[PDB]
């Protein structure tokens, strides 16, 4: 994961 998730918004 991250905090945002694998599926989330790019850093």
């Amino acid at each position: 994961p991250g905090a945002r998730g694998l599926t989330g918004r790019p850093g």
Partner: antibody, heavy 116, light 112 residues
Framework: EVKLEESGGGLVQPGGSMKLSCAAS????????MDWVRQSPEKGLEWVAEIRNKVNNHATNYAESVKGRFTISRDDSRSVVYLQMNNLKPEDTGIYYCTGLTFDYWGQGTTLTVSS | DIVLTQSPASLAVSLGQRATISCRASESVDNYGISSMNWFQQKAGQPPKFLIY???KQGSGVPARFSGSGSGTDFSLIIHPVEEDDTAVYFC?????????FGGGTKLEIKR
């Protein structure tokens, strides 16, 4: 093991209110960004609302069709996300999924029927 | 809003064969060097299950027979070899920015 359980779905008359609740476990809740997504045969899958972690100031976002009506929030001490829905329309009918870590993990969902 | 348009609508593949499903976005989903395109499997009566992230990378526990490709506006999901349990609707989904949006879904039928 990740688990999300939604509750609080049911029947409501047009213009009424309802509060959905999402109990999450199996991951660091305070870090996760959480969302609500809904599904209907007419609209398909629509993202509804987002709430982010403490580091992003618990920032909320909403789909245009629910702004001013729906309010998302969270209790990090209890690992729960809420969705307060006001002024419900028939078009808000569908199955409402709670998702964690944006869309990595999904609950079984709860049904909302808006009708007279 | 970024609109995602899937093709084909449905599709029938024999066991052990390749299924290729496409997704065209109305604007680029590229941001900070990642193509923010995710794929989901929805089996009958179940919630969507997360398969692919960042166009081509595979989610934890997802079989190797699922894999995606693409960048910018054109993406696809490849399933090979197809098996009986892959009968499902597959959705593409974009996380480049708010509002997050989904494709309309594509139905994969297993031929027999």
């Amino acid at each position: 093991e990740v688990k999300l359980e939604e509750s609080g779905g049911g029947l409501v008359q047009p213009g009424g209110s309802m509060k959905l609740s999402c109990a999450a476990s199996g991951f660091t809740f305070s870090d996760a960004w959480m969302d609500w997504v809904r599904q209907s045969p007419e609209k398909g899958l629509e993202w509804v609302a987002e709430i982010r972690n403490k580091v992003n100031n618990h920032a909320t976002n909403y789909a245009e069709s629910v702004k001013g009506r729906f309010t998302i929030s969270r209790d990090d001490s209890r690992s729960v996300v809420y969705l307060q829905m006001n002024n419900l329309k028939p078009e808000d009918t569908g199955i409402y999924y709670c998702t964690g870590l944006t869309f990595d993990y999904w609950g079984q969902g709860t049904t909302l029927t808006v009708s007279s | 809003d970024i609109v995602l348009t899937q093709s084909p609508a449905s599709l029938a593949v024999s066991l052990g064969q390749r299924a290729t499903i496409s997704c065209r976005a109305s604007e680029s989903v590229d941001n900070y060097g990642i193509s923010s395109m995710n794929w989901f499997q929805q089996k009958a009566g179940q919630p969507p299950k997360f398969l692919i992230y960042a166009a081509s990378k595979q989610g934890s526990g997802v079989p190797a027979r699922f894999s995606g490709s693409g960048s910018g506006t054109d993406f696809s999901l490849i399933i090979h070899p197809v098996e009986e349990d892959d009968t499902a609707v597959y959705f593409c989904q974009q996380s480049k920015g708010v509002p997050y949006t989904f494709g309309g879904g594509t139905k994969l039928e297993i031929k027999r």
